[PDB]
Amino acid sequence: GVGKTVLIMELINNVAKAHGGYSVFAGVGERTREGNDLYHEMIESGVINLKDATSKVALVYGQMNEPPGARARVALTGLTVAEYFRDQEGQDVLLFIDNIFRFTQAGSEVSALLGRIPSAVGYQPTLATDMGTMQERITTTKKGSITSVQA
Amino acid sequence: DLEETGRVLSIGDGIARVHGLRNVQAEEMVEFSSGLKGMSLNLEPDNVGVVVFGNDKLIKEGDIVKRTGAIVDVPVGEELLGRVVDALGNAIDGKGPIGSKTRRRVGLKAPGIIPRISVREPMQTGIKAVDSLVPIGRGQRELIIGDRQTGKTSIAIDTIINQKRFNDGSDEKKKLYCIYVAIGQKRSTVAQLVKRLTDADAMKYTIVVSATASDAAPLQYLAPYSGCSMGEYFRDNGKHALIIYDDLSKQAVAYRQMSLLLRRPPGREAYPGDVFYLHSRLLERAAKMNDAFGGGSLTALPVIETQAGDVSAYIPTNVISITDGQIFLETELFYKGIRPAINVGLSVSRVGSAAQTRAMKQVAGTMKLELAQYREVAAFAQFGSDLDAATQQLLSRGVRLTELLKQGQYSPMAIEEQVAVIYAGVRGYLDKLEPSKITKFENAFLSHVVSQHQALLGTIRADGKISEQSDAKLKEIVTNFLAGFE
Amino acid sequence: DLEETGRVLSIGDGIARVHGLRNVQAEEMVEFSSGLKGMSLNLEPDNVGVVVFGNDKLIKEGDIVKRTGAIVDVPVGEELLGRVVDALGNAIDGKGPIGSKTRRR
Amino acid sequence: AKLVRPPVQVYGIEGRYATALYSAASKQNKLEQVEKELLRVAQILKEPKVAASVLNPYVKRSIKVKSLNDITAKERFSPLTTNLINLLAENGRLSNTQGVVSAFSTMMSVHRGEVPCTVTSASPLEEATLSELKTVLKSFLSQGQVLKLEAKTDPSILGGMIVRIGEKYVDMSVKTKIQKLGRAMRE
Amino acid sequence: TLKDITRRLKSIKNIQKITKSMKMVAAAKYASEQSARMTAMDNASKNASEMIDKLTLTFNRTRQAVITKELIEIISGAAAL
Numbered sequence A: 001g002v003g004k005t006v007l008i009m010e011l012i013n014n015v016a017k018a019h020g021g022y023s024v025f026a027g028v029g030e031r032t033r034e035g036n037d038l039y040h041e042m043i044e045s046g047v048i049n050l051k052d053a054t055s056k057v058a059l060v061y062g063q064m065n066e067p068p069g070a071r072a073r074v075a076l077t078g079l080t081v082a083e084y085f086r087d088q089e090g091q092d093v094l095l096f097i098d099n100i101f102r103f104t105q106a107g108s109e110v111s112a113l114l115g116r117i118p119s120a121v122g123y124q125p126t127l128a129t130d131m132g133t134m135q136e137r138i139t140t141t142k143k144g145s146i147t148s149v150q151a
Numbered sequence B: 001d002l003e004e005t006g007r008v009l010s011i012g013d014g015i016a017r018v019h020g021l022r023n024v025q026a027e028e029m030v031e032f033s034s035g036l037k038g039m040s041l042n043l044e045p046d047n048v049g050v051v052v053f054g055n056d057k058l059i060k061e062g063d064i065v066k067r068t069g070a071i072v073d074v075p076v077g078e079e080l081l082g083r084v085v086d087a088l089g090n091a092i093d094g095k096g097p098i099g100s101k102t103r104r105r106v107g108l109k110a111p112g113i114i115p116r117i118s119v120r121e122p123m124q125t126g127i128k129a130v131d132s133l134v135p136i137g138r139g140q141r142e143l144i145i146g147d148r149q150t151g152k153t154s155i156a157i158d159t160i161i162n163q164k165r166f167n168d169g170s171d172e173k174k175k176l177y178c179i180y181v182a183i184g185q186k187r188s189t190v191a192q193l194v195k196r197l198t199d200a201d202a203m204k205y206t207i208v209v210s211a212t213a214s215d216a217a218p219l220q221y222l223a224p225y226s227g228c229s230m231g232e233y234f235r236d237n238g239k240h241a242l243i244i245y246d247d248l249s250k251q252a253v254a255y256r257q258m259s260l261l262l263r264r265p266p267g268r269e270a271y272p273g274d275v276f277y278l279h280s281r282l283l284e285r286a287a288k289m290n291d292a293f294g295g296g297s298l299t300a301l302p303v304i305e306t307q308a309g310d311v312s313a314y315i316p317t318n319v320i321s322i323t324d325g326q327i328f329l330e331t332e333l334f335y336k337g338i339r340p341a342i343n344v345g346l347s348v349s350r351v352g353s354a355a356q357t358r359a360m361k362q363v364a365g366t367m368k369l370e371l372a373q374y375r376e377v378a379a380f381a382q383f384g385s386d387l388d389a390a391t392q393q394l395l396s397r398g399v400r401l402t403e404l405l406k407q408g409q410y411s412p413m414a415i416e417e418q419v420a421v422i423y424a425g426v427r428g429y430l431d432k433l434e435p436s437k438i439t440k441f442e443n444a445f446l447s448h449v450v451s452q453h454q455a456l457l458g459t460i461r462a463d464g465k466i467s468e469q470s471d472a473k474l475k476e477i478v479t480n481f482l483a484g485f486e
Numbered sequence C: 001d002l003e004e005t006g007r008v009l010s011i012g013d014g015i016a017r018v019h020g021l022r023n024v025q026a027e028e029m030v031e032f033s034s035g036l037k038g039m040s041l042n043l044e045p046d047n048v049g050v051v052v053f054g055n056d057k058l059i060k061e062g063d064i065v066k067r068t069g070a071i072v073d074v075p076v077g078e079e080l081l082g083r084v085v086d087a088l089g090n091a092i093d094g095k096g097p098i099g100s101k102t103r104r105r
Numbered sequence D: 001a002k003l004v005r006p007p008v009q010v011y012g013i014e015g016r017y018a019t020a021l022y023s024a025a026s027k028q029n030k031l032e033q034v035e036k037e038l039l040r041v042a043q044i045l046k047e048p049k050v051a052a053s054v055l056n057p058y059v060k061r062s063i064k065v066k067s068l069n070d071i072t073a074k075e076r077f078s079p080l081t082t083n084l085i086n087l088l089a090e091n092g093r094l095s096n097t098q099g100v101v102s103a104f105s106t107m108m109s110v111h112r113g114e115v116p117c118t119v120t121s122a123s124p125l126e127e128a129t130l131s132e133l134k135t136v137l138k139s140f141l142s143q144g145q146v147l148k149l150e151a152k153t154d155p156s157i158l159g160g161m162i163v164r165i166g167e168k169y170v171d172m173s174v175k176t177k178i179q180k181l182g183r184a185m186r187e
Numbered sequence E: 001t002l003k004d005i006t007r008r009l010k011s012i013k014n015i016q017k018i019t020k021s022m023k024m025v026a027a028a029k030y031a032s033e034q035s036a037r038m039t040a041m042d043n044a045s046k047n048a049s050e051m052i053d054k055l056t057l058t059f060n061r062t063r064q065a066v067i068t069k070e071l072i073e074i075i076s077g078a079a080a081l
């Protein structure tokens, strides 16, 4: 109910104006209806311009109708797109991940398909073979700063 | 320079199958071609299951794996103090190689029955609640259990910082060298921790073993044992150490992944059959020796992060069964204003009174009894105006003491100042002051006593008890200050 | 042959382990000799796992399984309105055929 | 029933049948005979005709074992080899035969003392230094051995030589040298 | 269900300690109706306590069932290889 995408777009535009930083929106395992709604609401809010090169956000979308491998590795794609900006232009990027819940359940499905780890361990945010090795890439390097906002 | 070797049948997830190595030992350190080390955990008729202490991207199939001939060991010594190392001792602070000359195994056995003596000397943390109601001793294993973001790391940092007064001091028998094993924590938080321990000049005597979240599961599994060996060095050579595993739940998770990838039969909650063995052989090495062996000590403060107070889980139950007590933190206390959010009823110390100086014992018996009397009736509040006056005084004094237990961050109080303020709190002197001013009081009063009455605190610290002389002087100072406090 | 046709290694509980069928695709609908169709779900290195679209009584160890090249497909259109059909689009309301000119995967 | 284990062990069903035949031959002294007849029966079972016939999964077990017994009995097999064949057959382990044979071959590769050792260098060597090197790496061996040299060439090590003799492994190549140099000058 | 059992048991604990507070308050105001309120709230607290014991039995039963079920899941997922 509460206007949230407006707050995300405001954070994007404000970090892009005040500072010189861009933003990456990861859409890991999310409803394509909501994803299209956000894409349009951003187009008609100036954050994205289809007829310019002054857009303030890059989008990475992994939909729910895609295999667990997709929805698991689609969090790292946006992370890498923001890692470039950070470690190549010194910006303070703003990386959104629509859900960590989706990412961890996708990783749990991935490890259930390989049938090597019981389905009671899921994805462990501390192990480097799961979410940890991802969540630690989002820090304050002495070359820049990624920051992750997670609905 | 010929070394017995093997090939890599398979690599990945931190688990390398190695064909050959017909003379490798169980728990032996192997060395790959990329420079990475590893531990041979599974010895099977046709191959060896090795865990790699690094990333598995530097090894491919057919890669040569050399032996080393040694059980996994890490360098120990005083050359570690002030450094930040990984689970294997290799310095990651970028300040040159560790100039240590001796190494110690990570899987040594704990001392037996004979080399031990009872826990008697206190291990001052600086937190009023901990040092008063849930005391700790030297050679004790005091668990710190709680939810996420409740102030466990903070209690460990305060305990590490507090020993500055004894380390910079002159006494050699009251010096306590700290060790902070970090397991499964972001590198940024370890950086905050090291800058905070160097801002307080505490890194001068502290070791940090960091096995972060991006570190391989074998590294997070090994880190506590490397830290405990570094501490066991001091413990066996006559000095007094203290080790904080923050935390053991994530070391258990790393061991669980390792065991599942080594094809070992899972147990409850998918943990291996011997995770109790893991944690108990880690924790029983925290002992207190006798004078015939050196009189050393090694206090362990294992940390456990539960999920919604679930101390009836597997790993919390194990670590509670192994330790000598617990310090239960809460999110409800953390929100209702108590910080440090220590739960006094659930927390316990099985050594307890044996690990206190006489002054803190004198005041803490009365404090703990009155706090029990407060909690047994604490639900009766919000209608106190309609109940017995003695129970109303119990409720009021209880609120007074509970707010006497709050404390700011990175400010560990000396023991004599602790007993001073708790004295001024339990003798009824605050039943006149309303609760919203107890913090103002405690602050101003403690500043007054440390500024104008240094000799009193010096004598109380040199004796450790509140003698009736110092008792009368406390009457004096408390009443004269309180008479003037706004 | 053993590239476009295979031979049932095993049958049971609606699962047929079919030998051969080297050129079969995943999720493709093969046809047993008894008229019963099946969907090849497991493509294993040694055999194919075919889920049978019927009763495994009519299938015996050693039967011939032929590729059809047709992945599952159902009729569509407005002609399907008012008709009760089964999971594969065959009318089961006993009102004749369905004049569906359009199919869809 | 006591068994005599070979000096090296192979595992799986391959190694189990290999050591079974090794003990069954060393108990009546026919290692060489069963070995050569094994390699020849492996050649026989790999001719496309019976090589195709033998894996067809519907050919009856009794009919196929009798067909194979017929085909093997004409080469004048000793009873041990045809016993192994009939055991692998009525146990349905025929597709593994050659593998087993390979194992058994390598089995004998240790009975004669044949130690396989690799000496890999940048570019192919000329056999004067290769002969003196045969002498050099035959020097470490004990009483009663024979060695098998299998040298391969790779310029990726850009010099030196690597001697992988059994499990002993010396890496005198300049690659490991320069890696040591770098790791030392950085540390 | 473990969590719904905790829900109901916390509800009953709430009203139990509520009647405890109200009993001790009405016993304070006892220095006719107030004495009746005291005894009635005493009986209500003892009733809620016996219900808490029943719910604790049921909770322990459900906890054992949950642990056994998760173990069966783990071992049956591991034994399929």
Ligand SMILES: Nc1ncnc2c1ncn2[C@@H]1O[C@H](COP(=O)(O)OP(=O)(O)OP(=O)(O)O)[C@@H](O)[C@H]1O
Binding pocket: B147, B148, B149, B150, B151, B152, B153, B154, B155, B339, B340, B407, B408, B409
């Ligand atoms: N005694 C205190 N008084 C006031 N605030 C405190 C106190 N201790 C900690 N805090 C604050 O509460 C926050 C969380 O504390 P802390 O990180 O130590 O708990 P934690 O459980 O170890 O964290 P994590 O769950 O990440 O491991 C910190 O920001 C800290 O500043």
Ligand SMILES: [Mg+2]
Binding pocket: A099, A100, A101, A150, A151
């Ligand atoms: Mg979430």
Ligand SMILES: [Mg+2]
Binding pocket: B152, B153, B154, B246
């Ligand atoms: Mg913490």
